[PDB]
Every structure is written in structure tokens, then in C-alpha cells.
Amino acid sequence: MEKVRYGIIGVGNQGGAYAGFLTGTGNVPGMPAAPCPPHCALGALCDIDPQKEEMCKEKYPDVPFYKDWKDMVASGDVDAVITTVPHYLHTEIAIYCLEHGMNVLVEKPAGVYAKSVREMNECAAAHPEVTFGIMFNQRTNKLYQKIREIVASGELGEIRRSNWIINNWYRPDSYYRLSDWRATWGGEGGGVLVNQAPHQLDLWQWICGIPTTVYANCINGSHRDIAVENDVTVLTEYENGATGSFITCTHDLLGTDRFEIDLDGGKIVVEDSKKAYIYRFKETETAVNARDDKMFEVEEFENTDGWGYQHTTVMENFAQHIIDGTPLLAPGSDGINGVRLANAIQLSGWTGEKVANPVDEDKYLAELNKRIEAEGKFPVRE
Amino acid sequence: MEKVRYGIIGVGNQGGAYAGFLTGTCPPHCALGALCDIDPQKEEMCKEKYPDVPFYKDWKDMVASGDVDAVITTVPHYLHTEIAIYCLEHGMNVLVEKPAGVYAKSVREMNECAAAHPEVTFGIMFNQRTNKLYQKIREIVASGELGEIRRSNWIINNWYRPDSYYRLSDWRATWGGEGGGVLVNQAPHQLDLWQWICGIPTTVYANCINGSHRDIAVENDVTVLTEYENGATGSFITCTHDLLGTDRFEIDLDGGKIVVEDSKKAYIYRFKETETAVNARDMDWMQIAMLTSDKMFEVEEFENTDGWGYQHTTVMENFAQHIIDGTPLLAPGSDGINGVRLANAIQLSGWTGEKVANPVDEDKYLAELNKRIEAEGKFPVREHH
Ligand SMILES: NC(=O)c1ccc[n+]([C@@H]2O[C@H](COP(=O)([O-])OP(=O)(O)OC[C@H]3O[C@@H](n4cnc5c(N)ncnc54)[C@H](O)[C@@H]3O)[C@@H](O)[C@H]2O)c1
Ligand SMILES: NC(=O)c1ccc[n+]([C@@H]2O[C@H](COP(=O)([O-])OP(=O)(O)OC[C@H]3O[C@@H](n4cnc5c(N)ncnc54)[C@H](O)[C@@H]3O)[C@@H](O)[C@H]2O)c1
């Protein structure tokens, strides 16, 4: 049980990268690549595009190739698959694999609409022997683990506020024109929220809990020739009375990336997703208020993860679950938290109203489908 | 006239400060004409500290006395428009304190009154407009040098105020006394500044928590989203329960970025090329990769701190100068309504849980305020029309 063979569905940008990581062919001069994880190997490659097949024949000549991912699953050349394909296919593949005893590592975001993701979760719960995971690779980052640990420990008391401005992923019209599926309601089901935002959206929920209510201002085609949102401002509320805000866009040439958490007993500020300043109050504010600088102590944490580290670490973690039951950092059921939040943001955005989180699945789907229909590029979803 | 005598209505903390500045216990064109307070203790203090300065219980008597050439409304906010309107109708120059008023209806009436008596000088104490820091940022934005604004965000949590502070004043933090908490107290100078530099929001969405970690009925934790005619967005966050509050004001523009830290220091980033230009170039991913990794932007730094009394005296002097020789006002009183409307819109959004257009319906706001006043039971309900 030394190694788990992985089949990549979609040898696109992400799929290609994964293939390189598994093969040890990942490194670019000027880019260290993480070595192949011990328990991981590349079993097979699947793509519907002939050009991709040609590339696969060239770069990976001795690696079995399949046009149809169902054929790859049945081949027994692979022990698990990774869904590096457009998001709409994620739950479709997952459900099929769970029903056919095939371990599935689903890419972010888990899916486009919460209904399909819920079905996937229920399917997995009904085939528990099958390993079911999501590629929330940022959970392998010691930075976010550090912040989660401190918050969850209750050492700094309860959260009162979170604020994350993350504007540093500039993407011009030229980038948007590169992919047909990306930035299309029918292709992606959204823009920034379904692409750049999901890892962060999961992280925010993972560290700060899941918002009870979502209010969002979503601008479609902000300084860009697309129909989907790429400038988003969100307000959230939480069971315990805390508030939150999240701001992101793809038109900022010099975007802030600053994540603040304010707590009863301290404060955390994370800059550029690398460095965290942790402030511990000598006394909780509640205590200070009751009474009627030397007052705080500051701790610093910095971590940067090298190319391939996060994805390989997930791959290895996932393999290990299959092999010896090691717990998953990213159990696939968790994928729905991020999808629900993205859906709630979009629906708030579309209706101009605050919404409870999660939103009604059918209401979201209708509004998505309406947009898909108008776009006319892709089939509506049932 | 060489000097304008000022009558202070409300020798409270602000009134006292002003009195000191003018006594030198002064700006060249400014003097203290008279003091007015309804509290006997204040009168006694005024007799002690300012024995040669005429004192009046009734501010209407002070106005008519001809001991003063202008008045300053250092009294609870509900009186601001009442005094202003009276003074405009009686040819008396009036410098209205922040916020201009509690509810927009009364402030609008004040503005219309002033517009009907234009010979009377009408001003507001937006003393932060005298701060070279905010002047610098306004100038750059308004010049169009950095192109249009796309986003503003101001987190300002550094005015920690515990329950003990709230207990100090009966009028403060009461719907009937103040008409709000953080929005009517700490927030107004900032709210004006935000509007002054970034324009006035078309729409306001707000999350306002009453009695956040505090034993008060009014809001003291506020998160706001705004939209603007030109498609920009904005956010404003403030509260009085943060022991170590951020104060960071960011403006993102087509052609640069501004970040102001702790209300003292500004970092100005000027893009070599505007984003619109970069987008038009349709640069390839390698070029995009080069962008994100300092060559693209240049940084300028600006820092100013204003010493005690500078801002208030400078306004006083500016105001006097308008009366004397027509010098333009840095803070024309009509502008006071921008901040009041925004505060009202924030509150009303907060109360209804819905986005609102700015400005909101005056009667709707007043009703919701009055409902809260009635429940509080500390003060009489306020009725206009
Ligand atoms: N975990 C992460 O950090 C991360 C990073 C990037 C992308 N991803 C995820 O990977 C997915 C997209 O990969 P990408 O962004 O490289 O897209 P891409 O367009 O570069 O690659 C997709 C490939 O899938 C192929 N394809 C589409 N439908 C197929 C099908 N039914 N069978 C086989 N091949 C099919 C296409 O031919 C294409 O070659 C998305 O879910 C994205 O969110 C995750
Ligand atoms: N511009 C600034 O920097 C700044 C700073 C603080 C306060 N202020 C403003 O000053 C005003 C008062 O605030 P404060 O902190 O001085 O409060 P305060 O309660 O200390 O002072 C108000 C004073 O007015 C008196 N008063 C009430 N009704 C009166 C009446 N009818 N006639 C005469 N006196 C009357 C009270 O007895 C008291 O002495 C408010 O509008 C506040 O917004 C402005």
C-alpha cells in the first residue's frame, strides 16, 4: 500500500501542474517544485481536447491516457481521481465515483450551486468507505493553521469582527479572453467568487465560523468586458453577534491584502498572506470595561509555502487517508461551506437585499439559470 | 471690522475650550464677545474665569445685545438648526457645530433659510478641513491627477470609550438627547471628510449594533457599504469597544492609491500607467506576472499633526475673515447636510436591514427616530411639519 495512483481529469493548467508534481517534471528554472509525495503517483491522464492528448503523449508517453473519465475510472489504472475540470462537472464526477467505489479528490470550488454539492455530500455519507476530499490546499499553510489554532483555542476570547481586503490578484481583459469557460455564468457560475475567492472564502469561514447572514455588493464587468462579478464587498453577521467584511476585485493594480480579526482578548492582523501580527491584551476588553503600550504584547508569525507544497501536501494527506486512515485536513463535506457563502453573496448581490446564510437552493438556482439563459453560451442547469 | 466678537452658546467642554482659545486663557480677527449657558454652575464658572465677559442665560438675549457679531452653537445637536434659523432670520452670523443637526429635515430647512438670507455668514465647524493632511489628499483626488476613484475604505476603531465615559453626559448616547451614538459623536468629522474627499454616496447599506459591549441604547459598532454616481464603492467601519483600533483610510483610483495611517501619515502611490491604460495594452501573462512578484509605481509620503487649538481657531479665523473681507469659507454651512444625510441613511438602513438610496426620506427617518425616542422615555419626541 506504498502509493496511491491518481488519475487527473482535465490536464489543463491545474491538471498539468499536478501531473508535473507527481512525475517530478514540475520544476521550472527559476521555480523550485515540490518533490513527488511518498505515497502519491500519477496513474493516468484524461482530457477531451486532442491537443491536450498530444501534449500528454509528448510529456508523459508511458502514462495511460483516456478521453472519457468514466473509462479511466473503470480501467483500474488509478486508485483515485482529481477533478481539474470546469466546476460544473465537479459534483457530477464525484457522485459517479462514490457510487462506483472510486476515491475522489474534488477541486475548489466544490461546485457551482449548493444543491448539487449537498447531493454530493449525501452520496458520500452513503458510501463512507470511499475517500472523499476537497483541494483546500491553503489549509496546509502553517500561517492559517496558526491563526485557526489561536482563535479556536479561545485564548483570545470570542471574535467580535473580521475584515479581509484582498485586491492583489490583478487580471486584465486579456486574461479573461484566454478561457471560454472562465468568467461565464454558464461556464463558471460566477467570476471572482468562483475563481480567486473560494480558497479565501473557505479560510475565512474556517477561522471565523460560518456567517448567519450575508449582505453583498457585486459589480459585474467592473472595468472589464465580462458579465460576471469581479468587484465584491460583503458584510456578514455571526451566531455570536460578531460582524465581518470581505472585499475583493481584479482591477486593482496595487491591491491591499490585509486580514484583521478583532477579539475580546486580542487582535490579529495578517499582511500579504505571509505575515501575522498577534496582539494579546493584558486584560480582556470586557474586564477593562467592567473596571470603571504595556497593555498589549505582540507576537509575529511568518510562513510562505513554495510552489507545489500545498497541493502535494493535500495529495499526500489524501493518499494517507486511503492507505492507513490518517484524518483528512480537507474532508470533502466541508466544501459546501464555501459554496453556500459564494451563493449567498451572489444572491444578495443580485437582489440588493440582506439574506440568511445559507440561501434557498432553488431560489439561487433560478437566478443563476436566468443569467445563464440570457448569456446564451451554455445550457441551463437542472 | 478688525475683529469679530463671538458669542458662545453652551460653555460645555467644547464651549470652554473655545472661550480659552479666544481669551488666550487668539486668532487676529477673532475675540470673545459673550458667554451663554442655561446651567447656573456654568454661569458661576463664567463669572470666575471670565469676569469681564458679558454672560447671558438666554442665547436670544445675547444675540439681541449687540455684544456679539457671531455665535457658535456649542450645545447639544438638537438645538443647532433651531439657533441657526433664528440667527439667519435676525441678521446674526452663525457658526454651527458638528454635526450640523440630528435629522436632515431640520438641516435642510436651515440651509434654505440661509439661502434666503445670503448676506448672513453661515458656516460649520468642520475643523478637520484645516488639516494639511486632508487638504493634501483632497487636492490630489480633486485634481484628477490620479484619475477617478474606484474604492474607498476607512476603518477607524481607535476611539475606545468605556461605559464609564458613556455615563459622564446625560444628553450624549441617548436617542432623545443626541439622536444616535457613534454616528452623531465620534463619526461626523470623519463622515464629512469621507464625503469631502470621495464625494457623496448614491446608496448606503449599514449594519449598526446598539449597545455593542456597552450599556447604551444607541449604535456604537457600525459597518457601512456605499456606492457612488461614478460606479465606485466604499466602506466605513467604526466602534468604541476596540482597545487597539485600526485607523486606516484607503482610496483606490484609476491612476494611483492613497493610504492614510493613524490620521497623521499618508502614503501616495502613483501608477506609471493608469489601470485603464494597462488594460488597453492587453499585456500577456508574462507581462502580468512581472507586475506581481515596485517598478510599476512611485511612492510619496506626507505627514501632518495639528497642535491643540489649531483647527478650531483656524476655522474661527476663516469665518471671521469671511464676515470682514469676503474670504471664502473652508466650511460653508450648507455642506453640513452631507454628513447628516449620510448618518441618517446609515441609521435607517441599520434599523430596516435594507439598502437605501441616499438621501433617505426625511419623514421616514424622523418616524423611526421618534419611535426610538418614545421607547427611551428620557426626552420629548421631535416633530417637524
Ligand atoms: N486548488 C487550486 O489551487 C486550484 C487552482 C487552479 C484551478 N483549480 C481548479 O481546477 C479547475 C480548472 O482547471 P483549470 O482552471 O486549469 O482549467 P483549464 O481550462 O486550464 O483546464 C481544464 C481542462 O479540462 C478539460 N475538460 C473539460 N471538460 C472535460 C471532460 N468532461 N473530460 C475531460 N477533460 C475535460 C479541458 O479540455 C481542459 O483541457 C477548476 O475547478 C479550478 O477551480 C484549483
Ligand atoms: N468641533 C469639535 O471638535 C467638537 C468637539 C466636541 C464637541 N463638539 C460639539 O459641541 C456641542 C456640545 O458638545 P460638548 O462636548 O461641549 O457638550 P457639553 O454637554 O459639555 O456642553 C453643552 C453645554 O451647553 C449647555 N446648554 C444646553 N442647552 C443650552 C441652552 N439652551 N442655552 C445655553 N446653553 C445650553 C449645557 O448646559 C452645557 O453647558 C455638540 O454639537 C458637539 O457635537 C464639537
Which DSSP string do the residues of B243-300 spell out, in sequence order? Answer: TT--EEEEEEESSEEEEEETTTEEEEEEESS-HHHHHHHT--HHHHHHH---TTEEEE
A245 near B CB under 8 A: yes
Instruction: State whether A223 and B150 contact (CB < 8 Å).
Output: yes
Separation of alpha carbons A12 and A317, rounded Å: 23
Does residue A382 belong to any structural domain of this protein?
Answer: no
CA distances from A288 to A156, A291, B164 (A): 14, 5, 10
B41 and B137 part of one domain = no
Does any ligand 1 atom lie closer than 6 A to the CB of residue A108?
yes
Considering the domain architecture, whether residues A217 and A109 belong to the same structural domain is answered as no
Q: Which of A231, A243, A262 lies nearest to residue B233, judging by beta carbons?
A: A231
Q: What is the CATH number of the domain that holds A207?
A: 3.30.360.10
Closest chain A residue by Cα to residue B206? A235
Side-chain half-sphere CA neighbours of B318 within 13 A: 21
Q: Are residues A319 and A235 in the same domain?
A: no
Measured over the CA atoms of residue B374, residue B378, residue B380 and residue B381, the dihedral's sign is negative
Whether the bond between B40 and the residue before it is cis, its omega within 30 degrees of 0, is: no
The per-residue DSSP string of A20-62 comes to: HHHHT---BTTB--PPPPTTEEEEEEE-S-HHHHHHHHHH-TT
Q: Looking at chain B, which residue has its C-alpha nearest residue A296?
A: B244
Q: Which candidate, A35, A14, A139, places its Cα nearest to that of A87?
A: A14
How many structural domains comprise chain A?
Answer: 2
What is the phi-psi region of residue B10: left when phi exceeds 0, alpha when psi lies from -120 to 50, beta otherwise?
left
Q: Do B244 and A175 touch (CB under 8 A)?
A: no
Ligand 2: centre distance to CA A160 (Å):
32
Within this chain, do residues A151 and A132 fall inside the same structural domain, yes or no?
A: no
Nearest alpha-carbon partner for B355 in B343, B345, B342? B345
Q: How far apart are CA B341 and CA A110, in angstroms?
A: 43
Judge if B119 and B185 occupy the same domain.
no
| Nearest to A215, CA basis, from B298, B72, B324, B235 | B235
Task: Give CA–CA dist A88/A185, Å, rounded.
Answer: 11
Query: Buried b / exposed e across B184-195, counting CB within 10 Å, b at 16+?
Result: bbbbbbbbbbbb
Asked if B305 has any chain A CB less than 8 Å from its own CB, the reply is no
Cβ atoms B83, B109 nearer than 8 A: no
Straight-line distance from the first to the last Cα atom of chain B, in angstroms, rounded to the nearest whole number:
40
The per-residue DSSP string of B68-130 comes to -SEEEE-S-GGGHHHHHHHHHHTT-EEEEPSSS-SSHHHHHHHHHHHHHSTTS-EEE--GGGG
Grid cell at residue A9: 481529469
Neighbours of B52 (CB within 10 A): 5
Within a domain: residue B385? no
* Residues linked to residue B31 through DSSP beta bridges, in sequence order: B5
Closest Cβ–Cβ partner in B243, B269, B292 for A285 = B243
User: Please, what is the angle between helix A197-208 and helix A142-153, to 10°?
Assistant: 30
CB contact under 8 A, B278 and A171: no
Q: What domain range is A33 assigned to?
A: 4-136+308-332
Nearest chain B residue (CA) to A269? B246
Same domain flag for A119 and A147: no
Burial (CB count within 10 angstroms: exposed 0-12, middle 13-18, buried 19+), residue A231:
buried
Residue A320 near residue A326, CB atoms below 8 Å: yes
Distances (CA, A) of B295 to B140, B251, B256, B372: 22, 21, 14, 55
Angstrom distance (rounded) from CA B4 to CA B7: 10
Specify the amino acid at residue B56.
Y
Please report whether residue B173 resides in a domain: yes
Instruction: Mutation target for A interface from B209, B212, B243: give the one with most A CBs within 10 A.
Output: B243
Closest Cα of chain A to B84: distance in Å? 38
C-alpha distance from B207 to closest chain A C-alpha (Å): 8
User: Is A48 inside a domain boundary?
Assistant: yes
Q: Are B30 and B42 in contact (CB under 8 A)?
A: no
Same domain, residue pair B290 and B166: yes
CB contact B174 to A (< 8 Å) = no
Q: What is the CATH number of the domain that holds A106?
A: 3.40.50.720
Q: Is B163 inside any structural domain? A: yes
Same-domain check for residues A370 and A279: yes
For Cα atoms B200, B204, B209, give the angle at the middle one, nearest 5 degrees: 125
Residue whose grid cell is 439561487: A364
Q: Are residues A68 and A212 in the same domain?
A: no
Decide whether any atom of ligand 2 lies within 6 Å of the B15 Cβ. Answer: yes
Asked if residue A41 is part of any domain, the answer here is: yes
Nearest to A160 by CA among B162, B242, B217: B242
| Residue pair B274/B146 in contact by the 8 Å Cβ criterion | no
By Cβ distance, the residue of A165, A174, A354 closest to B283 is A174
Ligand 1 atom with the shortest distance to the CA of A194: 43
CB neighbour list of residue A153: distance below 8 Å, 6 or more residues apart: none
B381 domain residue, yes or no: no
Q: Which residue of A has its CA nearest to B286?
A: A175
Do B58 and B165 belong together in one domain? Answer: no
Test the B interface: residue of A212, A246, A254 with most B CBs within 10 Å? A254
Does one domain contain both B189 and B112?
A: no
Distance between alpha carbon B20 and the CA centroid of its chain, in Å?
22
B284 found inside a domain: yes
**Rounded to whole angstroms, how far apart are CA atoms B110 and B334?**
8
- Ligand 2 centroid to residue B11 C-alpha, Å: 7
Q: For B301, what's the count of Cα atoms within 13 Å in the CB-facing half-sphere?
A: 4
Instruction: Give the orientation angle of helix B132-143 with respect to helix B187-198, to 10 degrees.
Output: 30
Which regions of chain A does DSSP assign to beta strands (E)? 4-9, 40-46, 65-66, 80-83, 103-106, 132-134, 159-166, 213-220, 229-237, 243-249, 257-263, 266-271, 275-281, 296-302, 355-356
Structural determination approach: X-ray
Residue B62: name the closest of B7, B128, B5, B122 by CA: B7
Distance A336 CA to ligand 1 centre (A): 19
Say if residue B317 is in the same domain as residue B279. Answer: no
